């Protein structure tokens, strides 16, 4: 081979050594997990929770929209009703061994009950323990949507909210009333 290209190659190797050495003189780019906590943006799609309304009741009306919108089919729930007439989940289970954390259930929730939260540490020793029941999903507050209350908009009468007491609702006029 040519001597000129040999000298060019030697100079290029020396230059590469020089850049790697100067990059050794640089600053570390490592975020030291777990001593340094990982920053997650507020809409990060991690662990799924069920949230509560500002009045403290659970937001889920067991409408099963998240379960059907799930492409993996890893949400199972059953509707139950209290004595006042509000709907709630009798049970709610998410199989997190199947869940792909796609956020379609949060997108499909009309009450903002189901939410994907910035939490990624969900490793488990047993796969059966990745099936999260309702006691593992229901949190103490409203999560990412602080003020929305579906039952303040719905037309059904529940405790503390009779007919005509929802948003943009008039009082019910009886057909027996004297006014035309």
């Amino acid at each position: 081979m040519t001597l000129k290209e040999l000298l060019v190659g030697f100079g290029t190797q020396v230059r590469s050594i020089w850049m790697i050495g100067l990059h050794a003189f640089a600053k570390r780019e490592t975020r030291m997990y777990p001593e340094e906590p990982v920053y997650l943006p507020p809409r990060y799609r991690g662990r799924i929770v069920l949230t509560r309304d500002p009045d403290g009741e659970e937001r889920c009306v067991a409408c099963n929209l998240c379960a059907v919108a799930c492409p993996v089919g890893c949400i199972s729930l059953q509707k139950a009703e209290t004595k006042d007439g509000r709907w709630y989940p009798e049970f709610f289970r998410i199989n997190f061994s199947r869940c792909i954390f796609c956020g379609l259930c949060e997108e499909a929730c009309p009450t903002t009950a189901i939410q994907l939260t910035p939490d990624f540490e969900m490793g488990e020793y047993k796969r059966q323990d990745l099936v999260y029941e309702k006691e593992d999903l229901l949190i103490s507050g409203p999560g990412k949507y602080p003020e929305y209350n579906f039952y303040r908009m719905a037309g059904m009468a529940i405790d503390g909210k009779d007919k005509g007491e929802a948003e943009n609702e008039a009082k019910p006029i009886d057909v027996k009333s004297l006014l035309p």
Binding site: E29, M32, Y33, R43, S97, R98, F120, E124, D129, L138
Partner: protein
């Protein structure tokens, strides 16, 4: 509360206990994963291997192309029907002690691919030590799984020699992380609104 390979109690002289603790310390502080790329979960694994995450700090960066030298098999990807005998053969080629981490929903259960050409989870044919949910799990989830595996390794009993003592492997029955973190997870009230950064 252990598992012998049957639910038995803790078998652990006091010098043998110290030797077992030293062996477990050396095993958990030096874990050599096998370089096996199935799907996108492997991309997040090797992302954890790089400079911005530095999985080398836990002593787990020596990524082996030979299953003989590897201690940890990270099934990180879909367990396809054509790839499942390859996975089983590579697991069989490993040496005791060997540990398995399912990374991602595909390796956990099949994930979104409940389809004709996918085996629904790698626990169908190999025993798994640590499962990671996610599609993909982020690199620090793989690091957290490594610490979970280290904590599981540090409380297991294995024979010091193949000629002296009980040769059974006693794996501890750990408390589930769901039950452990249920105290701090339910107490969460308010999160940051998604419209911010």
């Amino acid at each position: 509360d252990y598992t012998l390979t049957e639910i038995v109690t803790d078998p652990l002289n006091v010098f043998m206990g110290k030797l077992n603790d030293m062996v477990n310390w050396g095993r958990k502080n030096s874990i050599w994963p096998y370089n096996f790329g199935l799907s996108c979960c492997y991309v997040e694994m090797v992302t954890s291997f790089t400079a911005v995450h530095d999985v080398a700090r836990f002593g787990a960066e020596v990524l082996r192309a030979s299953p003989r030298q590897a201690d940890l098999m990270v099934v990180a990807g879909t367990c396809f029907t054509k790839m499942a005998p390859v996975i089983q053969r590579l697991y069989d080629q490993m040496l005791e002690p060997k540990w398995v981490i399912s990374m991602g929903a595909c390796a956990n259960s099949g994930g979104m691919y409940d389809i004709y050409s996918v085996v629904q989870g790698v626990d169908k044919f190999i025993p798994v030590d640590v499962y990671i949910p996610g599609c993909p799990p982020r690199p620090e989830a793989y690091m957290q799984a490594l610490m979970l595996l280290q904590e599981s390794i540090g409380k297991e009993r294995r024979p010091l020699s193949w000629v002296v003592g009980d040769q059974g492997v006693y794996r501890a029955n750990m408390q589930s992380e769901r039950e452990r973190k249920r105290g701090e997870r339910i107490a969460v009230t308010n999160l940051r609104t998604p419209d911010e950064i």
